[PDB]
């Protein structure tokens, strides 16, 4: 088994801590959802190759521009997250997060991940967003942003229902294994 490093970036409420928790426990916690994620080394086998994938979070580091880049050394794959219930989180992807990740992680593949895909068909989400002349992020809007920023690929998932979670991490492992 080869060792690879994954770091997830994105705005404070993009759901990146919940995504790492649900993958690492292989379950959406029934009793208590942790506030924070320390780290984890997942055993993953993708396309016949065994990899130990170390998982890291940047939650808490969003307002600290000198502490945050300390998470980036030797990263093999980046998961750049946004929340599908928050079109404002997608707007900050090319403005702030993309120039940062391209500077500290040159040539590292980036996967743009649309989180909370379950809220696209949530009536409370739809009513709330319509009060700010908005709607949940459309699948094509996510694909077009990933295409624009030079992402390796675009994926969607729901940490709440577990749908798409496993696929994101197996694909991240494949991206980390490339050239």
């Amino acid at each position: 088994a080869i060792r690879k490093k994954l770091v997830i970036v994105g705005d404070g409420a993009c759901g990146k801590t919940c995504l790492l928790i649900v993958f690492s426990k292989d379950q959406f916690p029934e009793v208590y959802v942790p506030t924070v994620f320390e780290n984890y080394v997942a055993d993953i086998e993708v396309d016949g190759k065994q990899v130990e994938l170390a998982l890291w979070d940047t939650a808490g580091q969003e307002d600290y521009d000198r502490l945050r880049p300390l998470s980036y050394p030797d990263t093999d794959v980046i998961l750049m997250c946004f929340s599908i219930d928050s079109p404002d989180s997608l707007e900050n992807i090319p403005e702030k997060w993309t120039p940062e990740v391209k500077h500290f992680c040159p040539n590292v593949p980036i996967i743009l991940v649309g989180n909370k895909k379950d809220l696209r068909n949530d009536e409370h989400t739809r009513r709330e967003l319509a009060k700010m002349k908005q709607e949940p992020v459309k699948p094509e809007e996510g694909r077009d942003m990933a295409n624009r920023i030079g992402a390796f690929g675009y994926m969607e998932c729901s940490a709440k229902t577990k749908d798409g979670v496993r696929e994101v991490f197996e694909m991240a492992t494949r991206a980390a294994l490339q050239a």
Binding site: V31, Y32, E38, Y64, L67, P73, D74
Partner: protein, 245 residues
Amino acid sequence: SMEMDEKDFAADSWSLAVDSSFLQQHKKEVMKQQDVIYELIQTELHHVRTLKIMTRLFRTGMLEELHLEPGVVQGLFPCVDELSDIHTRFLSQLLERRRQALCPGSTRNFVIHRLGDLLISQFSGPSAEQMCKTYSEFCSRHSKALKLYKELYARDKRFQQFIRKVTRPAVLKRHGVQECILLVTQRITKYPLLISRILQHSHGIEEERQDLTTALGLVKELLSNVDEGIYQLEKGARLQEIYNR
């Protein structure tokens, strides 16, 4: 970690740690507050444990088994004794607050009603000055520590055998040298997230809400101060590179 503390923090939550007959005696809001307080202490216990792996397993093991040049072990593990002293003292206070609150005849049933004052004390005065000084120094030597580690693992056979040997057990899966350094760096930015969620469930007593609001403010002041005192040290950097920053 010592067995007593591991068992006390073995459950995924406070609600699963206490007896179900004790849990039934509390309101939902108190259970939600206690779950986040337990998470802060359980994560502090693991953080102190990361610092013990760095001092006792790695640092001390290199001094007693390997022949490294003077100042090499200090460059790999900067400020580890200082960090261990800050967090072991903070952990002793959190664990004593839990113990004092235990019901007579119980080693697991407790409720912590007054965490705010302990957090204001930790993130103010001399102990806050020491946290600021130590993390400003540690985080500025983080990249130099990583580059020094990689050089040693790649060029020294005895160093590579030492690492592979002490990191072989499964309990050390998440705690390699580089992983311990990033765990320590990320610890300080975990504090506002935990404190804000404790605050969200601490409106019952106006005094407690005020103390947690003050402590959250002090933690943010500390983080802003540490963030501004960081400049990555580079081995072999020339003065011209430094003053042209």
